[PDB]
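ingest -> validate -> predict -> emit
validate: passed (alphabet ok, no gaps, 240 aa)
predict: started
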Amino acid sequence: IKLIAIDIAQATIDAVQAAKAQGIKVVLCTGRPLTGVQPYLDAMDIDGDDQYAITFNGSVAQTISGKVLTNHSLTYEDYIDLEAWARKVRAHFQIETPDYIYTANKDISAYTIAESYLVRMLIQYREVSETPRDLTISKAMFVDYPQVIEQVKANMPQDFKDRFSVVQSAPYFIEVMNRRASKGGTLSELVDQLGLTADDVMTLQGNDLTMIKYAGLGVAMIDEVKEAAQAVTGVAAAIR
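emit:
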C-alpha cells in the first residue's frame, strides 16, 4: 500500500508524517477548491509537484503545486443555462474555478463572501457577458438565504436534475457539477497517471461509495458505505 485517499488533530498529523516519511502518497479529498485544504496540507508537510489532492468532489485532481491533472467540468453552455435560470428564479449564483469564484451578482450574497473567506479563494466579479469562455468550471452553485434556496429546490427544472449532479450541500447552498464526477472515479485517473493500481490504494461519509469500491483496501469511518468497505474504524487508527 503506497497511496492513501482521505475524505473530510496532532495524532492525525503525526500518523500522516509517518506514512509520508515511509514514502506514501497521501491524497486529500475534499468538496472545496485546493485553497480550502491548503492549511492542512501546510501542517502535514505535503506539497510540491509530486503530492496530490482531488478537489471539488473529484471534478478536479491536481498537484499540490497547482497543475490540474484531470478535470470534469460544466460546459460554457451549461453555465449559460444555469445562470439564466438563476435570474429567472431570483437567486444569487456563483461558479467556482480552480483559481477564482465568479459571480455576476452586483449585490453580492452574504454567503458568497462567507465562502470566499472560509475557503480562502478570491472573487472575480464579471457581468455574464464577461465570464471568460475558457474557464475550467468545476462547480456551480445557487447561493442564498434558505427561503430562496428552498424555492430553488422546489423549482429545479427536471432538465437540470438529469443533465447534472444537483445536491443541497447546505441550507444556503445548492451545488451543481458534472453528472459523472466522483472522488472515486477521479482517483482512478490520478492512480493510472502515477503508474499505480487500485490494489495499492487505501481510501477513507456518503459520496465516497465510488472511493471505497475502487480501492483494493477501502475503509469506512454512514451505513451503505460500511457495506462496500473492506474495513472500519480514527484516521491515524486506520493508517497504523
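Residues 191 and 237 are 24 Å apart (CA to CA).
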